[PDB]
Amino acid sequence: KKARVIVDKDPVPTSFEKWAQPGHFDRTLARGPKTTTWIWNLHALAHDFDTHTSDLEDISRKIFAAHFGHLAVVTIWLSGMIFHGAKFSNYEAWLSDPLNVRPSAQVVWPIVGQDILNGDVGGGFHGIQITSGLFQVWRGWGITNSFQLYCTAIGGLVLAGLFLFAGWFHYHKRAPKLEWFQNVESMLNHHLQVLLGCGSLGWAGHLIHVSAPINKLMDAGVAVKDIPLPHEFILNKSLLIDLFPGFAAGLTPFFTLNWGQYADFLTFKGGLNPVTGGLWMTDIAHHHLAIAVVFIIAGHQYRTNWGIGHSIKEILENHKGPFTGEGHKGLYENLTTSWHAQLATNLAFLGSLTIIIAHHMYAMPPYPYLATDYATQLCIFTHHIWIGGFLIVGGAAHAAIFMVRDYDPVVNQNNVLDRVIRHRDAIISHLNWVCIFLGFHSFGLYIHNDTMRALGRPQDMFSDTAIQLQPVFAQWVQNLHTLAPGGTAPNALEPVSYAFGGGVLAVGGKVAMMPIALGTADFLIHHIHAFTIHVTVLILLKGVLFARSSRLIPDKANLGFRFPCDGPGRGGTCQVSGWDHVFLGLFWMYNSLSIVIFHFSWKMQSDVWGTVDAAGNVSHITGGNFAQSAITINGWLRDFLWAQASQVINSYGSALSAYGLMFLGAHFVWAFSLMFLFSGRGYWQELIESIVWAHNKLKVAPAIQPRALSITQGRAVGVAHYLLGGIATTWAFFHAHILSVG
Amino acid sequence: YDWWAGNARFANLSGLFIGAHVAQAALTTLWAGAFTWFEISRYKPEIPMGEQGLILLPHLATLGFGVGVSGQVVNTYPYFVIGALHLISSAVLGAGALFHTFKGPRNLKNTTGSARKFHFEWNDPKQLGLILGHHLLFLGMAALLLVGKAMFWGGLYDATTQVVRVVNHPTLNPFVIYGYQTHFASVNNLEDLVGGHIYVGLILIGGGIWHIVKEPLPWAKKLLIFSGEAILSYSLGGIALAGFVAAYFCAVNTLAYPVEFYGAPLELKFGVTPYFADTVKLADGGYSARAWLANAHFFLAFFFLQGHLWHALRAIGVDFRQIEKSLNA
Amino acid sequence: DNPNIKYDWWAGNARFANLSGLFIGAHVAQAALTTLWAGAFTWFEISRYKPEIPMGEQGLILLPHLATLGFGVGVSGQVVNTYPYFVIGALHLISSAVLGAGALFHTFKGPRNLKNTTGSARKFHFEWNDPKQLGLILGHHLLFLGMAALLLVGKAMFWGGLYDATTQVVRVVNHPTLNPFVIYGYQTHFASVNNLEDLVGGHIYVGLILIGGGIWHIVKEPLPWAKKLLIFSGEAILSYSLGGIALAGFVAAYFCAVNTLAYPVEFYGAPLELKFGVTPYFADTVKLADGGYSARAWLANAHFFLAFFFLQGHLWHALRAIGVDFRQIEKS
Ligand code: CLA
Ligand code: CLA
Ligand code: CLA
Ligand SMILES: CC1=C(/C=C/C(C)=C/C=C/C(C)=C/C=C/C=C(C)/C=C/C=C(C)/C=C/C2=C(C)CCCC2(C)C)C(C)(C)CCC1
Ligand SMILES: CC1=C(/C=C/C(C)=C/C=C/C(C)=C/C=C/C=C(C)/C=C/C=C(C)/C=C/C2=C(C)CCCC2(C)C)C(C)(C)CCC1
Ligand SMILES: CC1=C(C/C=C(\C)CCC[C@H](C)CCC[C@H](C)CCCC(C)C)C(=O)c2ccccc2C1=O
Ligand code: SF4
Structure with missing residues (x-):
């Protein structure tokens, strides 16, 4: 049927009544608290x-x-970041001197001696040095003064206001019917063409008209005050012609397919701008134009109201083959009747995308003066890897929640989903094996190496100077990408990334990017990544495939998604639920990504980042110790953790002291988590009994009876403090180190 | 009719026809008024006025409105007052437009009294002659206003001696006016132009007065079709010719456009279409004011010719059947 | 149009449109807020005023208006006395407090209908359809404005005098420009006012006619001609007022821009040039640096844009007064 706007008017009357009725939303919680378990359940069930x-x-x-609510808080946050940039930063000083001035947009108040955290960051400014890369973003945007940030911040607060109103309006006042929501073809069309396509076209516009000219003048060493305001490039064409002659041709070359007339401001240069060490704005312009066209074309695929277009149901139903029975039949119903099926998908693939972004942004630094800001580089990579890893585990959780709650046998009979359930023992047994194989033939090589080195047998080690394990395939791919410009990418001048090959590119004294050579230490660490990802998938996939049932608990779907166990019987059934697989997958996600960011941190500091002599000799931050040290656990303990922790532990009485406190604080929160993870509810309820006795004895026993946390909450609190403590430790470690050496 | 052909729904009607056209007039005066101030603000005293993208202020400067000698332009106030007057005229016309559309009646069958008062029908050839009549009288008067501006209301700028001059000798004896049927677009003296608009005016009032008192002859009824689509097609044809002639005058004529306020020469080049490109290849931008007014009105004239054809093919009958059943046969 | 129409929170102030008591309360509140702005930002500008460096660029848009009335200035805008500004700031602030108290009275404490409160439409009650008491309201309001014009005439003739940019000093006018042959002359020569006696004589002619208009609008009821042409609806009379204020705003914005006496130039930037890009606006002259944009530029542009949006207010409310429902327009 036809996609159309159909809403109910005034579905939910707006009133503070229910604000004064905690747990109104659940029938069980509505009765009120009897025990303290109620208070937890309120927050646990809220959303x-x-x-x-x-x-x-x-x-x-x-x-x-x-969602309008979450868009409003994210817009408040982004507006705040830009406002703090406008008011409490050295952005304007940093524009004048990007290489020397250190980005800072957080000033601490002088109280209890914490003003020490306002360090000398350059540009006659005292504040906390920021590692979020906002200054490099705003420079890329072509923002050259505090007033432009103020305008952008206020604009954001108005957009956050609009998002709040929208959320109130689209719930309390004009709420769309289920018909509206289930127009997946129209939504995909509008989100591909407008959100992504027109967003990318719009942004190409800004890049071509504002960013590229302003950045080109700043790279030509023109003073920030002397650079024309971005509207002067539109109002005064002559200024824009002087930078990009192609604008002389006007818009006729676009309409007459004479697109070569724009070759000066729409480039395919490749590599990095040698002034800034970032990607060329003219390459970024052409990228966003090309993206915009592909998206606007892509989002005319799905049938809405005019017959032309695909129905996704028919596409899915037609994709079946001799191994997969009914194939993708019934998956359209899964993805259009379950929000959990959509949230599973979108978390899995947005999480996977965020990790791709992490990799693509370090290797091809897109912003001016990012590549040489080693603190920003390390921090944005690590940040986006972490966000990626959490989102992926969320994908698996909501996949398991779908299987327990929203999976229908009738819809999903002899389809790809049904058939994976029927060989889930074959899937998990094989994945179990490949996990053990990878574990032995990845980690066991480190244990072999540690032992050989310890026994004074370096000739018997797995190393470049001993038994070599050269990553020949990755080495071969690096070569192909290095030979691409002029060859298989003829109209490219440089490679997409100097990481693949070409020359060392240097900005100021420092290496922006150079070739990242792969050897035995790179082969070993890559097979550790493969191992730690395959084990995380084993846990999460087992969680989703065995959420509904197993050979142990046939009726696991009836027990639900989040239950602690089915009792000490059958030998003991602790942590069989799909929830408990997510709990265990989080530790493995944490373990996996920890080694990914450690790999990145050490490899970049030893083999990429560093100073460049006038002659052209590169002196790396840790002097290429990765090759010989990163092949033993002792080498990781000594040359990475012990060596690079010196800055964080010696930070007291300086501007980095906060990272020293965060480092210990995080070690504490981590250790605190072990109380929750190693212990059980039974002990704590019996201890509370005695404490309740004493409160009863003095007539201070609360009406809301104290209870030990639920078995599930114990685990939830455990893994929460473990991840917080562990991640925060590395965060404090990375900052204190890279804000000193980088 | 569909949404895209939604303005064809009030084609007949009465009140919305006045409203839609008095609105276009309000918009046209708003363009005339507001972009006067735009061009005043964008006009730089230095650099000759041709390449500054000014297509409205030169028209005022041609009428000898604060110019001086060799288009030096001392006074900007006369431009501002004209800009203000057309803008206040836009406001009252805009108010009058949305009155007749929304507030006023959607039919004039019982409003005014009769077809002579203000009502009209497309088929009836008596009141539409009266409408044409009074419109020719207004255009006739509008031509005599320019004659007024020439004779002693300031005088008009001449490119012969590059100054604001007062004409006091209009070119009578239409032996030269009939002479200018072949010697047109080579007008080099202002007395000939003034005498031209005098001859246009006195005949246009003479045409006007004749169209009101008399009804078209059965010869007219037999030849020309009295249908709203047909009279639109005749108008599209009339404007197309006007546009092509105006485009030619803009290109070749050196007096009616005083050269120093514009580029100056335009050469007719043909590739895929005819177009007046440019002379001296205007650098530091591209295309003079004259090049814009010549080409834009030529292309508009060509598309209005395609408008004549399209609407005239629908004028012979309805042709909404003959387009579809053209191939469905 | 249905009789029991209910408006949402965003159109929530349309609910008391008719009513009676809340209409007084809502407008006495606006008056209290307007006087609070007039009173409190006097002290703001006094505190922010630096004696040295010319007070065009320091963002003073209230104190210059007082300084124009020859109010502790001296010679060449030296500004000797700050105390008279503080007292005016205090007086408008105490007037705000009593108007605020009077506002909250009529809204909460007082009755929500005046049908049986005061006695009749002559006493203090009002109805939109009836053209008899709304003429009395217009009348007494014109009398007050007429008196308020004669207060400025008072300030000119006897109470200190007004500042002139001719000789750059506070001068007392003792020859007001009578003979309205010049007043009709100033229908074209307006916004080029070069002498204070002409301005004083102008407000004298405005005042004596505004009292004369006021007294007439009470004693007589509009002719059936008026009833036939103009519509007596609360939304219609609002639209006429929005139109009236829009014109006032545009005219005031022009006088602020071009006139060099009514704003004595030394207290401001001095020249404002009308440029058009996307909208008409009075940008600035001599490009005021070390901040940006003079006080004159603010008073000119702000009131021009306010005038434009009040014109959009006139259109919106006037289209709703005649009987255009936009809801059925977006339906088909
Ligand atoms: C402005 C006034 C307003 C009022 C009076 C109401 C009233 C109501 N809302 Mg509505 N709503 C509003 C605005 C409002 N809403 C807005 C702006 C949105 C868009 C998000 C919604 C979207 C919405 C939804 C989706 C639902 C409601 C529901 C309700 C009803 C129950 C809500 C409740 O009791 O929880 C009170 C809760 C709070 C006071 C907590 C607010 C949490 C905010 C939104 C986020 C805070 C984020 C903040 C940065 C904190 C981060 C972490 C912190 C550590 C820093 C109640 C009638 C519910 C309903 O009708 O169920 C029957 C319901 O399901 N509302
Ligand atoms: C867009 C992303 C997204 C959305 C919309 C949802 C939505 C939902 N999730 Mg899913 N989930 C996500 C991402 C998301 N999740 C991710 C990334 C993970 C991996 C961790 C999960 C793992 C997950 C599990 C295991 C479960 C859910 C559940 C749910 C449902 C209930 C959630 C609730 O009531 O929270 C209430 C909120 C709280 C209890 C507070 C959470 C606070 C966290 C633990 C710590 C925050 C620390 C912060 C980062 C640092 C500040 C520290 C400082 C304050 C000291 C709801 C449908 C539950 C469900 O039953 O589904 C039906 C459920 O059991 N989610
Ligand atoms: C250092 C800590 C540690 C170690 C060594 C292990 C080891 C293992 N975990 Mg466990 N895990 C841990 C912490 C650890 N975990 C923690 C803290 C948690 C809580 C979150 C978990 C939760 C967990 C889950 C949920 C899962 C695992 C799984 C695994 C197995 C993965 C398969 C594999 O790699 O086999 C290879 C073995 C090793 C890498 C261990 C070392 C091998 C040595 C170097 C070689 C042998 C030397 C020699 C022959 C010794 C014997 C000789 C002697 C008797 C004389 C592996 C046995 C997964 C699994 O079982 O799938 C297959 C699985 O799904 N673990
Ligand atoms: C940063 C930020 C901000 C801002 C932003 C902005 C400012 C934006 C804008 C945006 C934009 C500004 C965009 C736009 C775009 C556009 C587009 C997207 C267009 C398109 C077009 C087209 C598509 C075309 C077509 C066509 C035609 C029409 C005709 C001819 C043919 C063609 C095809 C060419 C704020 C404040 C919010 C806050 C936060 C942050
Ligand atoms: C019906 C219709 C339509 C149409 C309509 C129209 C088209 C309208 C028009 C209208 C108009 C067309 C209007 C106008 C207006 C105007 C104005 C609004 C003006 C103003 C002005 C001013 C404001 C001025 C002032 C000044 C001066 C005079 C001088 C000094 C300076 C100043 C600036 C102050 C449409 C399609 C939409 C839709 C459907 C229906
Ligand atoms: C320590 C521990 C507890 C005990 C911890 C409990 C009961 C949590 C209680 C702590 C909160 C912070 C009590 C908060 C009480 C009041 C709300 C505080 C009011 C005062 C503030 C306003 C300052 C468990 O219940 C448990 C259960 C299952 C597995 C492991 C464990 C576990 O390790
Ligand atoms: S130990 Fe805890 S989780 Fe395990 S069976 Fe007993 S109650 Fe269940």
């Missing part, structure tokens, strides 16, 4: 909308309104 109401339409409306 679990499927348990509020059965009605999919009411759930869809709650989700749509909540």
Whole structure:
């Protein structure tokens, strides 16, 4: 049927009544607290909308309104970052001197001696040095003064206001019906063509008209005050012609397919701008133009109201083959009747995308004066890897929640989903094996090496100077990408990244990017990554495939998604639920990504980053110790953790002291987590009994009876403090180190 | 009719036809008024006025409005007052437009009294002659306003001696006016132009007065079709010719456009289409004011010719059947 | 149009449109807020005023208006006395407090209908359709404005005098420009006012006619001609007022821009040039540096844009007064 706007008017009357009725949304919670378990359950169930109401339409409306809420808080945050840039930063000083001045946009108040944290960051400014790369973003945007940031910040607060109103309006006042929400073809069309396509075209516009000219003048060493305001490039064409002659041709070459007339401001240079060590704005312009066209074309695929276009259901139903029975039949119903099926997908692939972004942004630094800002480089890579890893585990969680709650046998009979359930023992047994194989033939090589080195047998080690394990395939791919410009990418001048090959590119004294040579230490660490990813997948996939049932618990779907166990019987059934697989996958996600960011940190500091002599000799931050040290655990303990922790532990009485405190604080929160993970509810409830006795004895026993946390909450609190403590430790470590050496 | 052909729904009607056209007039005066101030603000005293993208202020400067000698332009106030007057005229016309559309009646069958008062029908050839009549009288008067501006209301700028001059000898004896049927677009003296608009005016009032008192002859009824689509097609044809002639005058004529306020020479080049490109290849930008007014109105004239053809093919009958059943046969 | 129409929170102030008591309360509140702005930002500008460096660029848009009335200035805008500004700031602030108290009275404490409160439409009650009491309201308001014009005439003739840029000093006018042959002359020569006696004589002619208009609008009821042409609806009379204020705003913005006496130039930038890009606006002259944009540029542009949006207010409310429902327009 036809995609159309159809809403109910005034579905939910706006009133503070329910604000004064905590747990109104759940029938069980509505009765009120009897024990302290109620207080936890309130927060635990708050956003679990499927348990509020059965009605999919009411759930869809709650989700749509909540999203306007989350867009509002993210816009408040982004507006705040830009406002702090406008008011409490050395952005204007940093523009004048990017190489010397250190980016800072957080000033601490003088109280209890914490003003020490306002260090000398350059540009006659005292504040906390920021590692979020906002200054490099704003320079890329072509922002050259505090007033432009103020305008952008205020604009953001108005957009955050609009997003709040939208969320209130689209819930309380004009709530779309389920019909509206289930127009997946129209949504994909509008999100591909407008959100991504027109967003990318719009941005190409800004790049071509504002960013490229302003950045070109700044790279030509023109003073920030002397550079014309971005509107002067539109109003005064002559200024723009002088930088990019192609604008002389006007818009006729676009309409007459004489596109070579724009070859000066729409380039395919490759490599990096040698002044800034970032990607060329003219390459970025052409990228966003090319992206925009491909998206606007792509988003005319799905049939809406005019017959032309694909129906996704028919595409899915037609993709079946002799191994997969009914193939992708019934998956359209899964993805259009379950929000959890969509959230699973979108978290899995947005998480995977965020990790791709992490890799692509370090190797091809897109912003001016990012590549040489080693603190920003390390921090944005690590940040986006972490966000990626959490989102992926979220994908798996909501995949398991779908399997328990929203999976229908009738819809999903002899389809790809049904058939994976029927060989899940074959999937998990094989994945179990490949995990053990990778574990032995990746980690076991480190243990072999540690032992050989310890026994004074370096000739018997797995190393470049001993038994070599050269990553020949990755080495071969690096070569192909290095030979690409002029060859298999004829109209490229440089490679996409200097990481693949070409020359050392240097900005100031420092290496922006150079070839990242792969050897035995790179082969070993890559097979550690493969191992730690395959084990995380084993846990999460086992979680999703065995969420509904197993050979142990046939009726696991009836027990639900999040239950602690089915009792000490059958030998003991602790942590069989899909929730408990997510819990265990988080530790393995944490273990996996920890080694990824450690790999990145050490490899970049030893083999890429460093100073460049006038002659052209590169002196690396840790002097290429990775090749010989990163092949033993002792080498990681000594030359990475021990060596590079010197800055964080020696930070007291300086501007980095905060990272020293965060480092210990995080070690504490991590250790605190072991209380929750190693212990059980039974002990704590019995201890609370005695404490409750003493409160009873003095007539201070609370009406809301104290209870030990639930078995599940114990685990949830455990893994929360473990991840917080562990990640925060590395965060403090990375900052204190890279803000000293980088 | 569909949404895209939604303005064809009030084609007949009465009140919305006045409203839609008085709105276009309000918009046209708003363009005339507001972009006067735009061109005043964008006009730099230095650099000759041709390449500054000015297509409105030169028209005022041609009428000898604060110019001086050799287009030096001392006074900007006369341009501002004209800009203000057309802008206030836009406001009252805009108010009058949305009155007749929304507030006023959507039919004039019982409003004014009769077809002579203000009502009209497309088929009836008596009141549409009266409308044409009074419109020719207004155009006739509008031509005599320019004659007024020439004779002693300031005088008009001449490119012969590059100054604002007062004409006091209009070119009578239409032996030269009939002479200018072949010697047109080579007008080199202002007395000939003034005498031209005098001859246009006195005949246009003479045409006007004749169209009101008399009804078209059965010869006219037999030849020309009295249909809203047909009279639109005749108008599209009339404007197309006007546009092509105006485009030619803009290109070749050196007096009616005083050269120093514009580029100066335009050569007719043909590749895929005819177009007046440019002379001296205007650098530091591209295309003079004259080049814009010549080409834009030529292309508009060509598309209005395609408008004549399209609407005239629908004028012979309805042709909404003959386009579809053209191939469905 | 249905009789029991209910408006949302965003159109929530349309709910008391008719009513009676809340209409007084809502407008006495606006008056209290307007006087609070007039009173409190006097002290703001006094505190922010630096004696040295010319007070065009220091963002003073209230104190210059007082300084124009020859109010502790001296010679060549030297500004000797700051105390008279503080007292005016205090007086408008105490007027705000009593108007605020009067506002909250009529809204909460006082009755929500005046049908049986005061006695009749003559006493203090009002109805939109009836053209008899709304003429009385217009009348007494014109009398007050007429008196308020004669206060400025008072300030000119006897109470200190007004500052002139001719000789750059506070001067007392003792020869007001009578003979309205010059007042009709100033229908074209307006915004080029070069002498204070002409301005004083102008406000004298405005005042004596505004009292004369006021007194007439009480004693007589509009002719059936008026009833036939103009519509007596609360939305219609609002639209006429929005139109009236829009014109006032545009005229005031022009006088602020071009006139060099009514704003004595030394307290401001001095020249404002009308440029057009996307909208008409009075940008600035001599490009005021070390901040940006003179006080004159602010008073000119702000009131021009306010005038334009009040014109969009006139259109919106006037289209709703005649009987255009936009809801059925977006439906088909
Ligand atoms: C402005 C006034 C307002 C009022 C009076 C209401 C009133 C109501 N809302 Mg509505 N709503 C509003 C605005 C409002 N809403 C807005 C702006 C949105 C868009 C998000 C919504 C979207 C919405 C949804 C999706 C739902 C409601 C529901 C309701 C009803 C129950 C809500 C409740 O009791 O929880 C009170 C809760 C709070 C006071 C907590 C607010 C949490 C905010 C939104 C986020 C805070 C983020 C902040 C940065 C903190 C981060 C972490 C911190 C450590 C820093 C109640 C009638 C519910 C309902 O009808 O169920 C029957 C329901 O499901 N509203
Ligand atoms: C867009 C992303 C997204 C969305 C919309 C949802 C939505 C939902 N999730 Mg999913 N989930 C996500 C990402 C998301 N999740 C990710 C990334 C993970 C991996 C961790 C998960 C893993 C997950 C599990 C295991 C479960 C859910 C559940 C749910 C449902 C209930 C959530 C709730 O009530 O929280 C209430 C909120 C709290 C209890 C507070 C959370 C605070 C966290 C633990 C720590 C925050 C620390 C912070 C980062 C640092 C500040 C520290 C400082 C304050 C000291 C709801 C449908 C639950 C469900 O039953 O589904 C039906 C459920 O059991 N999610
Ligand atoms: C250092 C700590 C540590 C170690 C060594 C292990 C080891 C293992 N974990 Mg465990 N895990 C850990 C911490 C650890 N975990 C923690 C803290 C948690 C809580 C979150 C978990 C939760 C967990 C889950 C949820 C899962 C695992 C799984 C695994 C196995 C993965 C398969 C593999 O690599 O086999 C190869 C073995 C090794 C790498 C161990 C060292 C091998 C040595 C170097 C070689 C042998 C030397 C020699 C022959 C010794 C014997 C000789 C002697 C008797 C004389 C592996 C046995 C997964 C699994 O079982 O899938 C297959 C799985 O799904 N673990
Ligand atoms: C940063 C930020 C901000 C801002 C932003 C902005 C400012 C934006 C804008 C945006 C934009 C500004 C965009 C736009 C775009 C556009 C587009 C996207 C267009 C398109 C077009 C087209 C598509 C075309 C077509 C066509 C035609 C029409 C005709 C001819 C043919 C063609 C095809 C060419 C704020 C404040 C929010 C806050 C936060 C942050
Ligand atoms: C019906 C219709 C339509 C149409 C309409 C139209 C087209 C309208 C028009 C209208 C208009 C067309 C209007 C106008 C207006 C104007 C104005 C608004 C003006 C103003 C002005 C001013 C404001 C001025 C002032 C000044 C002066 C005079 C001088 C000094 C300076 C100043 C600036 C102050 C449409 C399609 C939409 C839709 C459908 C229906
Ligand atoms: C320590 C521990 C507890 C005990 C911890 C409990 C009961 C948590 C209680 C702590 C909170 C912070 C109590 C908060 C009480 C009041 C709300 C505080 C009011 C005062 C503030 C306003 C300052 C468990 O219950 C448990 C259960 C299952 C597995 C492991 C463990 C576990 O390790
Ligand atoms: S130990 Fe805890 S989780 Fe395990 S079976 Fe017993 S109650 Fe369940």
